[PDB]
Design a protein around this ligand. Sequence first.
Ligand SMILES: CCCCn1c(=O)n(Cc2ccccc2F)c(=O)c2[nH]c(Cc3ccc(NS(=O)(=O)c4cn(C)cn4)cc3)nc21
Ligand SMILES: [Mn+2]
Length: 602
Amino acid sequence: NLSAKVVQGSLDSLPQAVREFLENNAELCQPDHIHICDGSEEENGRLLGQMEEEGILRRLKKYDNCWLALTDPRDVARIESKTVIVTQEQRDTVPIPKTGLSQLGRWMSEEDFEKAFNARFPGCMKGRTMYVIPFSMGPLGSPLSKIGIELTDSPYVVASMRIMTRMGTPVLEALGDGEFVKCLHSVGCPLPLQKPLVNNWPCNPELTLIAHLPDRREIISFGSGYGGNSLLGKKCFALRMASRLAKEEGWLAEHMLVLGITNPEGEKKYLAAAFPSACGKTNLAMMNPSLPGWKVECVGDDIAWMKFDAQGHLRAINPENGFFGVAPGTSVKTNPNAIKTIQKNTIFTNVAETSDGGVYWEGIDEPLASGVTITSWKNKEWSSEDGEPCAHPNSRFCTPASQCPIIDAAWESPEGVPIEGIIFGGRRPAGVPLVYEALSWQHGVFVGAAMRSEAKIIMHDPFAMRPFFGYNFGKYLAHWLSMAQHPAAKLPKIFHVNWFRKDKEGKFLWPGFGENSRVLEWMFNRIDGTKLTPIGYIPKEDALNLKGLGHINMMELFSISKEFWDKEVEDIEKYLVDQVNADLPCEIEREILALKQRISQM
Ligand SMILES: CCCCn1c(=O)n(Cc2ccccc2F)c(=O)c2[nH]c(Cc3ccc(NS(=O)(=O)c4cn(C)cn4)cc3)nc21
Ligand SMILES: [Mn+2]
């Protein structure tokens, strides 16, 4: 009865668990066809083709196998306010803030979600093919990897998931009869359409909803076809759902880049890093280091799964297969390696396209030949005299990691890479030193918790996970804290960095970019064996390598003023106490207190 809708693969060759999941939602959504994805190149070809033919994608003829998708302007980003997590007890999902509404999550009762789902999903795929995407987060056959299944009515989702994950039949085989995350997605526009179609990009912003049910191990997403909303392995699974699993299983699912750094002598270390938006996260992941003799390799630019091995090493895998980076700002200057990565086999979204079939965006830093013209992401002829950008600010490239010219030899090792330092970061134009080191693990956890960052306004982003916590942030803090008790744990040095401090004239104090390799040099050697301060250790005078830099105003760059840090700790204590409240671990209350006492003596 359902086998007659299948246009590829076989119901019969599906694991029982998979088959039932599929049949259940195939029945509910009513797609005319079912297409079990085999992940093959030929399949990808025929999809790009179908998509080109349906007006969904357009090939960028300047490059080897590159494509452009343009969206409905109402559907251009991951959207927090339609994202929820569904649990029986709200408290499991978010803490109950003293004052008003939680900034740390968005809970929805199963009751309310029952009604919400039924108000969206039935018959939502009529007129459409449901694609079945089997995907592994992490190297195939890595004990650290977890498997998912995504049902979607979006060929864009399917082609992007081929890049951002390991996808295909080989995943069904590694999965066997075991567990997997159940991911359901629908652009929410059954045919015939009820509302007009813009840029051939089906979406339903009114009923848009991205919900996770951690207890049923499901991720259910409706109404958006974009990035974090539709590519379910990315934020929904790899951060939100993974954080829960990691909490149950004693490891860490985190919003961190991973890079390997080698010094001139050939000693290599892996470093992980968490940055809020607007910090050059991806730029750092592929850093071309300015110090002579040094090497930087990229393992991942977004998400890290970290688990202690038998030997006690905190090893990490990139659970992803590709980069989904923001395009605007990417240039040979800010990021040469990204530029080479995306030269082929790459899918772009809401970028501008030049008259000779290339891509374009603000900050690309690249003169156009004589009389070469530009079509904006709104599919309109564009000049630099329009005031408006040619590419949407959140526009993206979706590119294989394997194509990164500096990709790490072990970026795909099934055993992970040993992390020896965890870096937290922010954009603080004032107050916060370029770099400093935690006093302990416990104090380290608190530095993570205290993270704030500029976005005109200075906002809190604890661990850069604020939009991504899979469960109570309070219990998440306790989970990090317990990592120190893991038997034989070789715990990473914990650091905080800030590229963005400014002088009184509003000018940056640190040349940043490739020069940040001078900051990693400090971390590297600190890891191997400082000036003590109320916030942790900063470098000893003359410990930082400033050879070849101008005159750096170090004094001001590393100044720590009582007036500032009084205000800072007060803001941090108030935030954590209002927002985490009864779930705030007492060990954190002590770090606050300790900070306060060290500050009052200065
Ligand atoms: C959200 C956008 C962030 C842009 N950006 C940034 O991305 N990085 C991170 C970074 C980028 C590249 C490699 C490593 C690395 F850590 C930084 O370290 C960074 N630092 C700053 C402040 C700053 C400091 C100095 C200058 N001088 S500049 O000479 O204008 C300049 C531009 N480029 C590409 C290189 N030099 C301009 C800006 N802006 C930065
Ligand atoms: Mn991210």
